[PDB]
C-alpha cells in the first residue's frame, strides 16, 4: 500500500514483459526477409537480456527490493500483434513494414514503462536505480528511432 | 513525468482510454458468442464500464490540479486485438468460448493491476476521495474476474 509496493509491483511487470520479448524477438528477427531488420531484432534481442540483467541490478541496489513472479499480460497482447502480421503476409517487405509498426507499439509500451519506473524510482531516493533506468529507457529511444529510419529505408 | 501527480495523471488517463475502448470491445465480445450466459456477462460489464467511465469523471473533478490527457492506449488495444483474434477465427462452441472468457480475464488481469495502482497513488497523494472511488471500480473488476471464472469452469463441464 505504499510507493514502494507500487515500484515492485511495476518492476516485476517490466521484468515479465523483457522476458517474453526474449523470445518474440528470437522469432521476429527468423521471420524477416529484411537482413537489416532481422539484425535489428536479434540486436535488441541481445540488449533485452542486458536489460534484464539491469533490473537484477536495480533490485540489488535497494535491499528491500524484490522481484514478484507474474504474467505481463499487456506484452503477451502486443506480441500478439506480431504474430498475427506473419500469419497474414509473404515473406516479404509487406511483413517487414508491418512488423516494424508492430515493434513501434512494443516500444511505445516499454518506453512509458521505464519512464514511469525512472520517475519512481528518483521519488523514492533510489538514486542508483533511477540512473539505471534511464540507461534502459535510452536504449529503447534509440531502438525504436533505428526501427522508425529502418522503416523509412524499406 | 517528474512528480508521483505527474506518473499518477499519466496512469490514469491512460486508463480512462482503455474503458474508453472496452465498451466498444465488450458490445462486440457480447455478439461474438452463443453462450446465451456469457452474452450476458459482457453485456453486463459493457454497462459497468461505462459506469467505471463516469467513476473516473469523479475522480477527476475530486481533485482541483486533476485532468485526463489524451492518448490511446496501447495495452488495451493489444488485449482487445487479441480477444478479436478470437472473435473473427473459426473456432466454435465450447472451443470458442473457453478462449472469449479467457481473453476477457487478460483484459481483467489488466484492469485489476491498473486499478490498484491507481487506488494506492491516489492514497499516497492524499486523494482520499479518489482513493475510495478507484477501490470501488477495483472490487467491482475483481467480481467481474470471478464471474468470468465461474463461466469458464461451466465451459468446462458443459455437456
Redesign the interface.
Same mark, same amino acid.
Given at each position: 500500500? +505504499?510507493?514502494e %509496493? &507500487?515500484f515492485i =509491483?511495476?518492476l516485476s %511487470?517490466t521484468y515479465s514483459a523483457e522476458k517474453q520479448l526474449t523470445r518474440a524477438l528470437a522469432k521476429l528477427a527468423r521471420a524477416t526477409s529484411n537482413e537489416k531488420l532481422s539484425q535489428a531484432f536479434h540486436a535488441h534481442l541481445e540488449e533485452t537480456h542486458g536489460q534484464i540483467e539491469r533490473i537484477d541490478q536495480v533490485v540489488e541496489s535497494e535491499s528491500n527490493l524484490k522481484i514478484k513472479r507474474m504474467?505481463c &499480460? /499487456?506484452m @503477451? !497482447?502486443?506480441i500478439? @500483434?506480431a504474430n498475427?502480421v506473419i500469419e497474414s503476409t509473404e515473406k516479404n517487405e509487406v511483413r517487414d513494414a508491418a512488423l516494424i509498426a508492430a515493434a513501434q507499439?512494443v516500444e =511505445?509500451?516499454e518506453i /512509458?514503462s521505464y !519512464? +514511469?519506473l525512472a +520517475?519512481?524510482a @528518483?521519488?523514492l531516493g533510489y538514486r542508483k536505480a533511477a540512473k539505471l533506468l534511464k540507461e534502459t529507457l535510452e536504449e529503447e529511444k534509440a531502438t525504436d528511432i533505428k526501427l522508425t529510419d529502418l522503416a523509412i529505408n524499406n
Open positions: 500500500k +505504499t510507493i %509496493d &507500487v =509491483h511495476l %511487470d504474467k &499480460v /499487456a @503477451e !497482447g502486443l500478439e @500483434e498475427e507499439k =511505445h509500451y /512509458a !519512464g +514511469t +520517475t519512481l @528518483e521519488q
